Structures are given as C-alpha cells and as structure tokens.
Amino acid sequence: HVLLTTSAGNIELELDKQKAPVSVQNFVDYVNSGFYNNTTFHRVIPGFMIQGGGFTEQMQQKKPNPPIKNEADNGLRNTRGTIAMARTADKDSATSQFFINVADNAFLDHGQRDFGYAVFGKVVKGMDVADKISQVPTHDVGPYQNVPSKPVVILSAKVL
Amino acid sequence: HVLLTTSAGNIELELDKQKAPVSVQNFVDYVNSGFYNNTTFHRVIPGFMIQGGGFTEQMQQKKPNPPIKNEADNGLRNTRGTIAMARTADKDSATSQFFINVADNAFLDHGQRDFGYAVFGKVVKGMDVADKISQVPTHDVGPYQNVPSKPVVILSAKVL
Amino acid sequence: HVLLTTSAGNIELELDKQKAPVSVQNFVDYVNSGFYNNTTFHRVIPGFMIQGGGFTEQMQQKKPNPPIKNEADNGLRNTRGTIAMARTADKDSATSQFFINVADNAFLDHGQRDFGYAVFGKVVKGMDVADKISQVPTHDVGPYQNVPSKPVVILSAKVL
Amino acid sequence: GKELLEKVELTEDNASRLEEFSKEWKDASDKWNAMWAVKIEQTKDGKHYVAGIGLSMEDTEEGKLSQFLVAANRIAFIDPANGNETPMFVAQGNQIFMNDVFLKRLTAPTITSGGNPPAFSLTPDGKLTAKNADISGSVNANSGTLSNVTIAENCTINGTLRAEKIVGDIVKAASAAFPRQRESSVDWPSGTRTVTVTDDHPFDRQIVVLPLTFRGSKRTVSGRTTYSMCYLKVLMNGAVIYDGAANEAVQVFSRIVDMPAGRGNVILTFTLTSTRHSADIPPYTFASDVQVMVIKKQALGISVV
Amino acid sequence: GKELLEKVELTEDNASRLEEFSKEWKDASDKWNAMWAVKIEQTKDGKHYVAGIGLSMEDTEEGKLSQFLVAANRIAFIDPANGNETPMFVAQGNQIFMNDVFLKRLTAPTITSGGNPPAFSLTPDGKLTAKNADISGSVNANSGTLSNVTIAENCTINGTLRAEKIVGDIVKAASAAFPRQRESSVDWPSGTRTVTVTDDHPFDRQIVVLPLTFRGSKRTVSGRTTYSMCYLKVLMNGAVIYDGAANEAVQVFSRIVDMPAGRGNVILTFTLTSTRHSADIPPYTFASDVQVMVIKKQALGISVV
Amino acid sequence: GKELLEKVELTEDNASRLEEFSKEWKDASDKWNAMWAVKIEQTKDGKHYVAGIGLSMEDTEEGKLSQFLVAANRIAFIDPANGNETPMFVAQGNQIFMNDVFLKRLTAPTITSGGNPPAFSLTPDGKLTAKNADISGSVNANSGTLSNVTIAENCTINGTLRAEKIVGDIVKAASAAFPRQRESSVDWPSGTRTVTVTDDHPFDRQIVVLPLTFRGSKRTVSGRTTYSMCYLKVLMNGAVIYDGAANEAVQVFSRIVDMPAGRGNVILTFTLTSTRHSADIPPYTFASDVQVMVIKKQALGISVV
C-alpha cells in the first residue's frame, strides 16, 4: 500500500502487483527512495485525469531511472480511480510520470502494436481528494497547458 | 406492410413506396423470398442507428442480388424511426443491408454528388422493440465493432 | 453607446473604446454614416454567436471601406455578450462584419501569430433580443449556411 | 609506284568518315544543348538531392534554377513489386486534393473549419471546439447549459428543487364562518356555506373537513324548558352525506370526502338552520367555521380499522 | 623524300584515331539511345515542368509519355542546410501512409470515419457529427436527450416538476368512525379503531390526530340524576398516552405523535366504552370520527411556548 | 604532280578536324561522366518508375542508388493549362508542413492530439474521444454526468425526486397544551401559549389553527348556581382576532391566518384565563391543546362562498 500525502489530503493506492510486476516494482522503487516528495500534479484536466510524478514545485523536471517496458496487455482497463503510467510517444518510454483516471477512459486501453497505457494501481481511499484536485483552475497556455494555477504538491509518499 | 418478427419483439414498417420504388421493390423481394429470415442486427450504436440484413447468427455474410441505384434524392430525411439502405463506399452499391435511425441523422441526408443514404421505410409500430435493441451491450473490437454480445435475431420476416 | 434597433427589439452596446481605439472608430463610422440600416444577421448558430453587418435584406453584400488592423491583443476575451470584429482568412482583413458571442468562445481569444478575433463591444441591454435571435430556424444549405429563414433585419442604428 | 594506290585513298575515306562523324555530332550536340533536365546538387556531406530544373549542359549557381515543378495530374506512386499505381492527386471540379488513400494518420494537428469565425477547431494540444455538433454517447459535462433536452426516467437527479416549481398543490386549505342572523342585540349562525373544489388535477385528492362543532341551548323558565335547536346539513353534489340535530349537547361533523381525478367539480354545501326558544326568544345556537383541506390522497402505508 | 615518309604516316595515324573515336561513339551513342529520363515540357509562358518519363533521345508529343511514377519507398525530402532526410511515406503492414511529421495543419477539410453509414463526420463548413463519442467539459445543448446521466448537486434545475413523481408522501390522511352498538331504536359509539402507520419513509414524520370530541349525557327523573359515561383510551404501541372520562361536558383528544424513521410501525388504538344511564336505559354518548394526518415533520421556523 | 598538291594536304586539314573533334569530345565526355541524374528503373511489366539518383553514365544494380531526395522548398505542382504554381510545403519556424490547399478530404483516418496520454482521439472506425471539448447543439447522451450545468425551463425532467431535496416546507405542524394551575387535587388550564412562525420562505403561507374547544362549568348548590368562566383571547402580532367567554356550553376557536412572504414573523398568542366557582371552589374549565399547521397557501381552484 502507498499513501501520497498531498496539500489536498491523503490518497491510499492499492498496487496491482500480480498483473504489472515490473511497473509496480519501478513505482515502489520511486516512492521508496523519496522521488515523488515535493512533486506537483502538473497536468489536471477535469473529466479526464490528473497527471503527476515528473515536475517539482517550480515546474522543473527531475532525473528519472532508465525507462520500463509497457505492460498494458495485463487486461486492466483505464477505469475511474485507476493509475496508469504516463509515457512519451515511444511505447516502452514510461519512466516516472503516472496519472489517475478521474472518469472511464476506454481509448487509453489496449495491449497490441497500439500499446495504450499500463494500469498498475487503484485509488482505494481519498477519491474525494482526487475529485477536489480534478476541479482546480488550470491556465498556463504556452509551454505546458492545464497546469494548476496554485500547484498541487505531494508533500510526501509513505509506502506500507 | 412488413412484419419483422425478431427475438426482441415485432417491428412494423410502412414502406414509402411512391418515393423510392426500386429500393422498396428490392427490399420487398428480399423480404418475400425469406432472405432476412435468421439474420442479425450486426451493428448497433445507441444514439445512432441499428444495422441489419447482411449477416447470419455465426457472423457470416449472405449472397445478395446485383445492387440498386441510390434514390436518396426522394426528399425523405433520416429522421428517427426511418429505414435507410446501408451501402459500401460506392454510391450505387446498396444491395441488402438496411438500418433504422434511432435518432435524427441530418448528416446522412442528401440528393447530390454526395448521395447520402436513401430512406425508404418507417417504423409505424414496435419502436419500443428498437429502443430495447439499441441499448444491448456491444463488444467485438477487431473485424466488426458494435456487434451485440448476444446477437438479436430476425426470426421471421412476414409481408402483407 | 449605440442602438441596433432590429425587428426582434433593441440591443444596447457599450463600446470598449480605450482598448480597441481604431476598431471602435471604424465601427462608430459605419454606424454613424447609415451603413448597418436594413442589414441582416446573416449567420446565426445557436450556442455559438450571431453574425451581422455585411449583407442586405436580399443576401446582397455591401461595399465596405478599406479594412482595419487586428487589435485582438487588447486582452478582452470572447465572453458571452461581447461583439468581436468578423474578418476573412487574412488576419488584418476585418472591415464591417461583426458578431455577438451568445456563449463563452475561448478558442476565438488570441493576441499572437494566430491573431484570433478582436472584441471591441459588449451588450449591456437587450441580451433577451440576442437570445430570441439566436434560436430562430436557419436553413440555407449551399452558398451560405445558418442563414435565418425569416431574415433578422437591423431597421436602424442610432448613436449616443 | 605501288604506294600511290592504297594509302593515298585513305585521305579520302578518312575525310568521308570525318564528314559522317561531323553530321552525327551536329545532330547529337544540338539536341544535348537544347535538353532540359532535373538538376542534381549536393550538400556539404555528399547527399545529391534534386534542386530544380535546368539546361542539362550548363552549371548555374544553385540559383536561377527554374524550380522543380511537376504537373500534378502526372505524378503517381508505385510499389515496384506488384506494379500497383496510385495517383498523388484527385481532381474535384478544378480543385486538386491529395489522394487520401494516404492521409491515414494525423498526430497533434491543428484543424479549423470553413467560416471565419470558425465553428470547428482542434488545437494540437487536444482542446476541441465544436459549436455546431451533433453528439451521441457518454457526456461528462463540467459546465454549460441544457436548453430543450428530454431528461429520461433513469437519469439520477441528485440535487434540490424549490417548493414552488411543483405543478400540483399537494395540500390546500379554505375556511368560512356561517352567516350570522341577528335581532335586538343577539346573533346566531344561520345560512349556507358552499365549498367548491375545481377538478383541475391529474391525481386523486381527499377533501378533509376538519371537525365542525355545532350545538343549540336549553332554557328553563318557571319550570318550562325551551330547546333552541341547531341543524347542520351537508350536501355533496346535492346528495345528503350528513344531517344533525343539536339541542344543548354538541354534535361534531368531520369527514374525508374522496375527489377522484376527471369526475368533475365537488361541491359541498353546509347549511345551518337555528330554531328560536319560543315565539319571542331569539335562538341561542353555536356553530364553528367551515375549515376544509384538499390533500394529494395517498392510500399506501396508513391503515385504519 | 621526307614528304612521302612523314605526312604519308599521317593518313594511317588519322585512320587509327578515327577507329578509336568510332569505338567511343558506338560505346556512348548506344548508352544515350537506351537511356530513359524524366522529360521536361513547357507551358506557353516559359515554365518548364516535369511532364513524365520518356526516352532521352526522343520527342513524343507531350502525349504517350509514360507518366511520372516514383517508387514511394525511395522518395524523401531534405533540408539542403543541415542534411536532415525525411521520408514521404511510412510503411504500415502493406499499407503506405504519408509521413505525418508534415500534415500538421488542416483548413476546412471533409473528414468521415470508416463504417458506411459513418459514425463520425466533419463537414467543411464546420458541422460536426460524432454519434459514437465520449466528451468531457463545457457542453451547451440546444436539443437532444439524456438517458443514464447523473445530474450533480451543483447543477441548477430551473424548471417545474409534477406533484406526482415525488417518492415521499409529504402529507397523508385517514379516518374512520367508532363502531356503534344499538338496542331498541337508539345507538351509541363503543369499540376500537386501530390506526397503523407503516415505517416506509426515509424522513421523520408527525402523526397529527385532529381534535376528537367525546361526551356522555345526564338525565334527571324524579330528582334522580343518571350519568351516562364516555371513556376514550388511546394507546401508542400499547403504551397509554390518553385516558378521558366525559359525563355531560365534552372532552377533546388531539395530539401530534412523532414518527421517527427506522423505529418501526406506529400503532394508535382508540378505544371507546359507553356506560348505560341505569340497568335498563341505554347509554347516550357521542364521539366524533378518528381523523389522522401524517406530515413530513419539519421542526424549523415554527416555535411554540 | 596534281595529286601531290590536291590529295596530300587533305591529311593536314583532316588532322586539324580530328584534333577539333578530340577537343569537343574531351569537353563533352568529362561533362557526361561527371553528371548526376534521376535514374529510371523498370518493373517486370515495362512500367519505368523513378528509383533514385545516380551517375548518368553508370548502371548500379537498383541497389546503392543514393535515394530520390528532393529539396522540400524547391518542389511545387503546376496546372500546365493556366500555369498556376502551388508549393508542396509551407515553412512555419523551422517546421515544414504540407501546403494544406490539398488535404481537403480525409476518409477513416486515425487522429490523435499532442499530450501523451492524448486528450483528443478519432479512431478509424469512427469512435471519437474529446475529453477537453467545448460542444454546442443536439447532445444525445446514453451515460455520463453533468457537474455545473444550468438545466433550462423548457427541458422536460421526466423522472422522480425525493420528498427531501425540496427547499420549502409545503406543510408544517406544531402543538402545545395550556399550562395547568392546580390546587388541592384538581387542575384547570390557565396560562399563555405563543406560536411564532419565522418569515423564512419565498411564498405566501396560511397558518391553519385546527379547532380549539374550550368550556367552563355550572354547579347548583342549595338553589345557587355558580358559573366557572373560561376566556380565550388570541392575539396576532398584538392585535385581538378572537375573544371568547364559555360558561358551560363549549366555544370553538379556529382560523386560517394568512402569512405573506417578506412581511416578518407572525406571532399568535393564545391566552386562556379561568375564573373560580366562588371564593373557595376552584374553577372547573376545559381547553383543548393548541394545534397549528402552516401550509403553502394555494388560492386557486378551492372556492368558498
């Protein structure tokens, strides 16, 4: 079990360790070695998802480990409250950024040559925290869009 | 008048014969000579339309006649409860597949180079059958999407 | 302060003269020297905007002055009730056509290479007139779509 | 000599061959120098790209090259394995479009529609604006406004509504006192009160008549007892539903009259008649006001008897 | 002497050089005449475009030119400044698409989707049809229908609702008269009326028992006064909440019994007993009907005491 | 001889012509061999496509051909009838896009937006995902959730609401009994009950006071009749709306007091006073509880008189 202690509240997350072993190993290694301490949810779109885990409070990127393989064919779907790994255009480019699905994102599901996004976790407690975060006002048109005006800071990440 | 006796119930269709004479002749020839007996509504999208008349229970295509010319310039529109002939990319390729409009489809109407879809019939009784059919769960991602999981079958197609 | 005395009623517009000086000068020179009398709102899309000031009662385009420079970087946004200058593909091509935002049109705001649309006015009274105009039936598919079936004529334009 | 008859004719056959070669060279050179080609130029890496069109037997300076123009309807792409030919452009009434059998993948494009304020817009970061749409399936609105939308029965309507903005009445009340007939300085109740309920509701209703107490009086003078009677008579659409006589001890009328929907107006007639003690003494009778309430008539979990 | 031995050898060496040039010409001409090129043609303006592919040493008529075919996988675009190479087409399982690193800007296109009635359509004038969509943010509907939508608490629901289509009762009513036992030609009320309210509501309720009037009578014969007694005993879930005795002056029972949600059914028992004037005279007692109303129990801005 | 001066000088002009042809050949061959061209290859059908770029006077093997690179800013398409020139690419700040005057027709493409989980996605079979949209017109939802939507008046809201989730009260009730003053072993009602209704509603209301029965008593001892009086005085905001005196026969107070919106709190004061039979005998008076019910005040189809 992992707790993200944010300025908005506490998010208990149950890790699907049996379906995505390498993703959950990578996520637990980041959360164990205080990587997500003092990191913001830099991309909040209400009705879509809230994305965090790569940028510090001043919108500056952190140093990640070398990436992990995509395990999106584990058959877990991008349902409301699940966490998928965020990645770049490359299929196996997922390093550190994740996102929580605040709604049902069927178009982010697949295991095939269109790899989609690997769900590896689920919010079991603090869905109200995610619901309050999802509705914050976001306006940083230019470099990064949908950046919360007042940053949503993860104060600490406590792993059980 | 055509009885479409399906597993869901009975659908009553008044054929707009005076505006689409060749389409309605082709449709009544298929209906008379038991073509649509034991044929599924293979493509149902709730809010759009339900499409039937080409595939048997096992998802296999039947043998149609030579196609018919498009008669979409008869000025009948794709309003809720109207049947239009389904066709392929070719504008005069409509053979046997039809669809019922479950909503108002203004973008399927035209008589022009962009021939649109020829409305030739209307559901006069058994709309509730169409609303029950329109909401069945559909998951056949791959060859044909929006295929009902448990197929809805036209048991018999009796004509007056 | 300008009157648009239409067949639907009266629309009171407060000109934002301190932020769009030459645009509001052009608009006041058109309204002063009897240009917008007997001119229709030729483009009405409910939920978007109503566009007028270019076409006479029989869909005849009028002769404008040489165009004005785009002043959309004044920081005035395309909010509900504001008038923006309507222009062609060219960024500094705005002459005489304007439109009223009947809703919040964020995609029309910009001061950049993508010049957006310059807001220079606001409906202060007669928003009910704009609401009645926005919902009229519009069907002229072909040359110009979204043309009201019964034209919304600006009978006269009176300055204060 | 022998030497004058073989190698001296060589000067003439050689001249004939030279004239033939001169003619061939004139034929070929005048067509090489008139020949236009596609000119190949180089980067400072040895890459050899097409830089434009120019005279084949010239140099230019990579400048003044007259551009690489292709005639649009003449360009097509082949697979050099099966020989399938695919034209690059398709003509649509004096407009040339790309063949669109390519054009199967767009990633982060900006798309804008025709008019000039556009109705449709797709921003490369994925903001979509439609403004003239017809959508079906799975809407999650965060803001906006519905205008002529039929909300279905299976739509959860979590949230409150005002007490007003309810078409039906659920409860109404009305009241009146009986006409008072007076003589000298004493008044007694006597007259008719008519309670009419308009049948203007889709559901059943009950007309609850709250208790109506009426009584008479008794006087004993010189051992003679005089009774002042009170009579209350209630008519429902002319039919007598109550009839009471009160001497000195009170009677109470109360009733729940049922009002079915569509059966017409219900008219309740309360008529009080008072009788004098004697030929001289005015009557001493009492009757409480008529108070009536019309309720929504629910017959569910409230059992009596 | 020298002239027959010096310039005579000129004929032989000239013949040898002519043979060498003949060999070179036959080597190069056969290469030229077998060479296919891209043919450049001209407009009537001096424009020099590519008109097709043809034999280099020919003329044609701008017709019968065998078309400008390019092999698709071989065409790429360069920047002749840095040398970056960008292919025109990308292979995807025996299908060739454009590279899509171009294709960054679309202005008033027509887009339609696969099936043949299409689910998606984008008209060039900006009309959008989705019909199989999944939207979030800022919806402004002018028509349509919701089917399984959860309307949130913070959604303004301006508009009316019917009195029906409300799950709760808000107000109910019920009534019955006491059983009447009669002898000879006179009847008096005596018996039990049981009022049961099923606990089938989520909110607190009040059982308002509208005033219930009961009285006895008094008769005096030969100076002997006989009291006809009336007793009303009301039980709430078997617990006595009222007990009254009336002789000739009336008593009135009224109460508001609280009905909390989840506590179970409330049973109110109204028991009337009438006592005779004597061993022979039947009792002369009166008791009004039992009317009861169950309300939604608001305790807010209405105070007593 | 004549041939010594007419057929021997031919070996010199022949040599001069051969040297001139040698010079021309050296000038032209070194131009041909250094020349790069677009190489035309053939399918096994005689199709003659462009296979790449290579030296003009060479063969290669259809392999090692150095690709058909074109310089991007140099390629344009012409109509060879009017001479109109249309560039293939447009520069946008070190990014090259297609000219988008083509690109007018897309059928069953895959479109995806920027970010990497994308906000926009159009599947080739017609499924659309927007997730950051601003839509207007004709929404026809089958699932989802509204969050801050203003549902308009002309939106039909077919479906039920709870009895709770209604802001107004529609009906409220409240009740109390008069204070009882007692001496020895007998008690009589005497005191004041104050009913206050807060003005916290937007609509008119009626305060229905259910019937209040009160009476006194009569006692006759040694031919002396003593009256125990009962007085009820009701004040509405200090104004006397009722004043009653009951000796032995009951009086009943009931009223429907109007409570308009915005006029302030309504205070109903029920003052009941009892008078003793004599200087010694305590009063024997009765007065039923105060029971009040506040209704939403519909004045429509409930006519009286």
Author numbering:
A (entry chain f), B (entry chain z), C (entry chain j): 30 to 189
D (entry chain J), E (entry chain Z), F (entry chain F): 828 to 1132
What does the primary publication say about this deposited structure?
A 2.76 Å map of the central tail fiber in a closed state was obtained. AHS is a helix bundle formed by three α-helices, situated below the FNIIIs, securely anchoring the three FNIII-2 units together from the bottom. From bottom side to top side, its cross-section progressively expands from narrow to wide (left). The RBD, the C-terminus of gpJ, incorporates an immunoglobulin (Ig)-like domain, with four bottom loops (L1-L4) serving a pivotal role in receptor binding. The trimeric plug domains of gpI obstruct the tube, with the C-terminal region of gpH forming a coiled-coil superhelix that interacts with gpI.
Bacteriophage lambda’s tip protein, gpJ, plays a crucial role when attaching to the cell surface. The gpJ protein, comprised of 1132 residues, is located at the bottom end of the lambda phage tail, serving as a key component of the lambda baseplate. The gpJ trimer not only seals the tail tip into a closed cone but also extends a central tail fiber, providing the means through which lambda phage directly interacts with its host. Genetic evidence has identified the E. coli receptor LamB (ecLamB) as the direct target interacting with gpJ during the phage’s attachment process.
